[PDB]
Amino acid sequence: SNNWRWFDDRSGRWCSYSASNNSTIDSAWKSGETSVRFTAGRRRYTVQFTTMVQVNEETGNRRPVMLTL
């Protein structure tokens, strides 16, 4: 299992997804999908692997993601 992070523009640092959301994201990546949907606090997000951005499905807000193999 790789480590996925999202950039928190409030602190100005990368943050680890929960073990659970990391597992969802990384399984989609390894299975060859180009994007993956997950929920956190009842809100819906898509990680776009082609742009390496997390998109909020309600507001369209974009946060950067990164992968460490």
Curated annotation (Swiss-Prot):
PTM info: Phosphorylated on tyrosine; phosphorylation is probably required for its ability to inhibit TP53 transactivation.
Subcellular location: Cytoplasm; Nucleus; Mitochondrion
Gene behind the chain: HUWE1
Described function: E3 ubiquitin-protein ligase which mediates ubiquitination and subsequent proteasomal degradation of target proteins. Regulates apoptosis by catalyzing the polyubiquitination and degradation of MCL1. Mediates monoubiquitination of DNA polymerase beta (POLB) at 'Lys-41', 'Lys-61' and 'Lys-81', thereby playing a role in base-excision repair. Also ubiquitinates the p53/TP53 tumor suppressor and core histones including H1, H2A, H2B, H3 and H4. Ubiquitinates MFN2 to negatively regulate mitochondrial fusion in response to decreased stearoylation of TFRC.
Disease involvement: Intellectual developmental disorder, X-linked, syndromic, Turner type: An X-linked neurodevelopmental disorder with highly variable clinical manifestations. Common features consist of moderate to profound intellectual disability, delayed or absent speech, short stature with small hands and feet, and non-specific but recurrent dysmorphic facial features such as macrocephaly, microcephaly, a broad nasal tip, deep set eyes, epicanthic folds, short palpebral fissures and a short philtrum. Patients may manifest other features, such as hypotonia, seizures and delayed bone age.
Domain notes: The HECT domain mediates inhibition of the transcriptional activity of p53.
Organism: Homo sapiens
Similarity field: Belongs to the UPL family. TOM1/PTR1 subfamily.
Residue span, WWE domain: 1-67
Tissue/organ expression: Weakly expressed in heart, brain and placenta but not in other tissues. Expressed in a number of cell lines, predominantly in those from colorectal carcinomas.
Segment of the intact protein contained: 1614 to 1682 of 4374
Protein name: E3 ubiquitin-protein ligase HUWE1
Oligomer and partners: Interacts with isoform p14ARF of CDKN2A which strongly inhibits HUWE1 ubiquitin ligase activity. Interacts with MYCN, POLB and CDC6. Interacts with isoform 2 of PA2G4. Interacts with NR1D1. Interacts with AMBRA1. Interacts with HAPSTR1. Interacts with HAPSTR2. In hepatocytes, interacts with PAQR3; the interaction promotes PPARA poylubiquitination and STUB1-mediated degradation.
